[PDB]
Write a protein that binds this ligand. Structure first.
Ligand code: DMA
Ligand code: DMA
Ligand SMILES: [Ca+2]
Ligand SMILES: [Ca+2]
Lengths: 328, 292
């Protein structure tokens, strides 16, 4: 049995920096156009684990930063994340996010998209203030790669003959890259050698793969009330993810017409989800997904080998295990 | 006094070829539908006014370097991204093709900033990041006032300044700063772009006869019984009734003249620059914004 980890040590070590990050967040979500801070705070104040800014903070302190200018980057990262949520929820048609109704059901799809565009621009304004051209290139690139991954998913995730390799390419782009960017931007703020920033980048990329694999498994195996979003969104969208792909592969010839109807032609009821959830758990497909996630978590922990075994390093190792073990 | 758009287009030929090559190259992805969907909007737009601003401003400010071409291309990406996020349509779910438009928009927005990073110009990035922010505020404001019967002239101007003119101003200002000129020079060129943007929009509002002409007519056709009465009707049979209220109250004429005032302001902003082909082409453009 693998270690649980936790976020607790990370959160506690980063407390003094996150108060600065949260101050920037509340500040930059402000606008004279009143819908903007209303829509934004509905999402931001609703909750969220803040893992991405936490990783920027952790990476900066592990790399030994001498000022706190990384806090603006951490704030920018959360805005980028927040914006991608607004856009992704509109695209996927999801009804719940962080325990609240998805913003686009209250303010409309257009306003959700536009407020996302606001946050994206606010994120770059913040980065400009830090004067770190390298950190700005890192997050500009990450943001482009997210969009590419989302398009790739839109084009290719909606048929059952999706390969594992294309799936891993999608999750690397749409999810793991922002984690890699968050750590790498944190590291470059500190003004370090490329070996350290590359190591931290490596940590975040692998953490994000583990993270997304666990998220995909949680979509079938989690409870809506702990997740803050509807279990079964992927299935009801007709979106193939690894747990589904692996389950199809163990299922034999007898289930092929069920998937074809529910996913390929996308004809569904609520009963189809309960049937799918059972076939994903029972076939061990959920477990195999998490085995792969744990493999990526090991890679994330090994990526930090060059760093001193201090509290920041231990916090990041515990986060790697947490990425796989978490329920939300 | 007519002017042209054609004079600047011809002057900016050698520069715009390099801009269009950057535009084509940077829109590419290993994800095939991204450049396919982007080229549909880009190549079938024709005019390229916003990147022209950047080319023209950098040339008038006497740029020795090449950097403005990447900023010009980035400006077109931002412009295209904003167009992609407009057609999206409480309207909860996306129209067909809406999903790709959101995400290709996100791609181009991000590509623009990558392109700008390549110039190493932190001032240019600052200008365009702020522009992007203001545009997004302008677009949110327009949508929360899309219904509005009683929208004042001032607030409408604030909307179009943010959602249309700001990009023209930012394109010009960014072009100027890539030339390495002083603040007075970049400020003037910024002002040219801003006023030009306003002049284009207001004449476009006039060339269509919830814009300024209708807003003025309703404000000049008395209180709530041709205000809320027109707003309740706000079809094709119902059209020429409000047009009569537009012309007859002198609202269409008030729009055209305001448009011209903005064009003159644009021209007056260029007065510190040498009276050369670039300046005269920009002067002619300001007149074109009104005549066309
Ligand atoms: C890509 C992905 C799974 C996004 C949701 O992120 P998260 O689980 O970190 O969300 P939150 O910020 O709400 O904790
Ligand atoms: C915002 C983003 C990059 C989402 C991708 O992952 P997902 O659709 O699995 O996330 P969620 O389940 O949080 O909607
Ligand atoms: Ca989603
Ligand atoms: Ca998910």
């Amino acid at each position: 049995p693998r270690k649980s980890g936790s976020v607790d040590r990370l959160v506690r070590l980063a407390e003094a920096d996150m108060a600065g990050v949260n101050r920037l967040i509340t500040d930059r979500m402000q606008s004279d156009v009143a819908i903007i801070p209303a829509l934004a705070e509905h999402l931001i104040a609703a909750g969220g684990k803040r893992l991405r800014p936490l990783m920027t903070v952790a990476a900066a302190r592990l790399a030994g930063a001498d000022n706190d200018h990384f806090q603006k980057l951490a704030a920018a990262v959360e805005f980028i994340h927040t914006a991608t949520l607004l856009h992704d929820d509109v695209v996927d048609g999801s009804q719940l996010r962080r325990g609240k109704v998805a913003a686009h059901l209250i303010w409309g799809g257009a306003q959700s998209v536009l407020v996302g565009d606001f946050l994206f621009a606010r994120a770059f304004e913040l980065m400009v203030e830090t004067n770190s051209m390298k950190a700005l290139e890192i997050l500009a690139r990450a943001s482009r790669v997210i969009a590419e991954g989302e398009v790739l998913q839109l084009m290719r995730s909606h048929d059952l003959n999706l390969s594992q390799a294309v799936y891993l390419e999608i999750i690397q782009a749409k999810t793991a890259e922002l984690f890699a960017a968050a750590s790498e931007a944190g590291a470059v703020s500190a003004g370090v050698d490329v070996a350290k920033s590359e190591a931290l980048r490596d940590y975040g990329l692998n953490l994000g793969l583990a993270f997304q694999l666990a998220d995909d498994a949680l979509d079938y195996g989690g409870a809506t009330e702990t997740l803050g979003k509807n279990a079964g969104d992927d299935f009801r969208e007709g979106k193939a993810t690894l747990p589904l792909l692996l389950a199809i592969a163990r299922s034999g010839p007898r289930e092929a017409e069920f998937w074809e109807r529910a996913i390929g032609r996308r004809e569904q009821t609520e009963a189809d989800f309960r049937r799918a959830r059972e076939l994903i758990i029972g076939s061990g497909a959920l477990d195999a997904t998490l085995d792969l996630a744990a493999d990526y978590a090991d890679k994330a922990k090994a990526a930090l080998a060059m760093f001193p075994a201090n509290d920041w390093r231990e916090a990041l190792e515990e986060l790697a295990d947490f990425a796989v073990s978490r329920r939300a």
